[PDB]
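Notes from the 1:1 (GR / supervisor)

We went over the backlog. Supervisor wanted to see one worked example end to end before approving the batch request, so GR pasted a single chain during the call. The sequence is below; no edits were made to it. Supervisor asked that the structure be written out right there so they could see what the output format looks like.
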Amino acid sequence: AMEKDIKRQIQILEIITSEEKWFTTIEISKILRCCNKTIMKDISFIKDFLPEDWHIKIKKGKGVRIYLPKHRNEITFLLFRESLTFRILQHLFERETKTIATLAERLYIQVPSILPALKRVENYLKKFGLKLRKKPLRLEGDEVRIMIMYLDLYLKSYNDTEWPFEKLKKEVIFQYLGTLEESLGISLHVVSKRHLSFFIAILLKRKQQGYKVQLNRKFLYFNTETPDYVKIGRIFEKLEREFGVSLTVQDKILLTISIKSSKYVYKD
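Structure output shown during the call:
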């Protein structure tokens, strides 16, 4: 089970909540029987997506420890999407800004309670080179980095069977991917399809909000005649029409690089 991010995150939480004491990565690795190299990374994701009054502490030469308050609710995969951190980041997805006071009211929480949550949001954003400005509240940074942050957030907060996007049919997106595998003669790994379907959903939703992909100085010499880019561009024309957006060359290169970065085999 431990290759599934959300499952591994929950098992780590179950371990460090089992006793009021410090846990070393060795100790955790022993129980997971894998994944020694990713435990601290998982811990740094998890700590941002906790209930309000749960606190993880990291201490050199001690390891990790979690401090809990109250009636203890069952730890489930739902914890991530239920956190204040997630729910705030979902509101920041869209262009329409709020004040903190508005945001608090829409989340059904008191303003005092949102101030710590904002600091957890800022901490997660920091890892993607992103920032939060407050007057008004808005995500700030390179558009592509924003998409990567949302990709990470959705992949780690949902089971690999779930489809979190509204107003967007999974079967449609998977049809595009099916057409791409046919056109290129490849078979995408099931994980790569998940990443790509999420990334496309995210791109579609940001484009619908008006945001613009801008690539680094490098790729403005990308070969837009390379054969695989030529078919990718053609399949995505169907998408523009169907979702009512316009894909720039920036978009098509991004999507092409995403596909080329994926895991797949050639078909015969």
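Supervisor's comment: The first strand starts at residue 55 and ends at 59.
Batch request approved.
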